[PDB]
Design a protein around this nucleic acid. Structure first.
Ligand SMILES: [N+]
Lengths: 71, 152, 70
DNA sequence: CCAGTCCGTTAAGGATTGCGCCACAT
DNA sequence: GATGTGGCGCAATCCTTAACGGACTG
């Protein structure tokens, strides 16, 4: 129920067109940032896993010295 | 050949053959100087002949090649091509060695395969045929391609 | 080229489908990747907690140890 | 030339992408 | 109201890979 040859339509379109360009770059940008975060987290988690293991090792060792106490 | 065949000659021979046939090559070479009767039939029989199908292989075609090779073996290609209207030996041979032979596996490319390749190409270079010597089920064409666009 | 040519019609239909495919796939990747970050993020928190526990416990014990009478 | 092999290079088509109109969400 | 998002169909472009066209060997 509106005119597509309008000069106002023309500007509305350009407003949106500019907006879509923004939305898509942003997305492309985010999807990128996520993809990188996925790598680093994978790195980090591997690192933590080692710490936990090393910590659980030092803990057991210590736990034994206790029990091996002359009494 | 004598020299490179022009668009005219090609055309002139096509029209000549249409009228006179596939037998009168002594006359047809009278219209095309610089072209012996032998070269004329070869330019047509092996190129211009509009019946030379050079498109995709129907399951029909593929299956027929299988049977024949199955029975007589991967050789005598020219003879096998007589069973595939429109195709010639070379095609039949390639099709079979590259897509029809069971041994050829369609499996995806693994890190090992991808390795021996990166490995060997550094050594032997573009000796596709040789590199394939080290690949259980890969034709030189596959390997060659893989590299070309994969290993940039 | 003339758009009425049946050659065009098919070409388009062929590419349309191919488009909807690339896009339907890209969305799938983008989504599956999003999950991995969630998972890994959960995991990281879970691991950082355990590392907090053990570390504390260890420290607390080392203490009780060097504090032993004799 | 034939009958086999190799290999670089193509090219028909699917796979990507950017663009703009649009309906609908924030 | 205004600006943001997700679909969709084009149409130019890119990439993959069958198999084409030369060059070689016996
Ligand atoms: N043939």
């Amino acid at each position: 129920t509106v005119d597509k040859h309008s000069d106002e339509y023309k500007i509305r379109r350009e407003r949106n067109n500019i907006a879509v360009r923004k939305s898509r770059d942003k997305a492309k940008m985010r999807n990128l940032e996520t993809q990188h975060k996925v790598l680093e987290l994978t790195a980090e988690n591997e690192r933590l896993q080692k710490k936990v293991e090393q910590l659980s090792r030092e803990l057991s060792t210590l736990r034994n010295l206790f029990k091996q106490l002359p009494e | 050949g004598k020299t490179r065949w022009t668009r005219e000659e090609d055309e002139k021979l096509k029209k000549l053959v249409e009228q006179n046939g596939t037998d009168d090559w002594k006359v047809i070479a009278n219209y095309l100087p610089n072209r012996t009767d032998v070269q004329c039939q070869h330019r047509w029989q092996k190129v211009l002949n509009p019946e030379l199908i050079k498109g995709p292989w129907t399951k029909e075609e593929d299956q027929r090649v299988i049977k024949l090779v199955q029975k007589y073996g991967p050789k005598r290609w020219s003879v096998i091509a007589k069973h595939l209207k429109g195709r010639i030996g070379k095609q039949c041979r390639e099709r079979w060695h590259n897509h029809l032979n069971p041994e050829v596996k369609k499996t995806s490319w693994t890190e090992e395969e991808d390795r021996i390749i990166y490995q060997a190409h550094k050594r032997l270079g573009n000796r596709w045929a040789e590199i394939a010597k080290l690949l259980p089920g890969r034709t030189d064409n596959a390997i060659k391609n893989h590299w070309n666009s994969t290993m940039r």
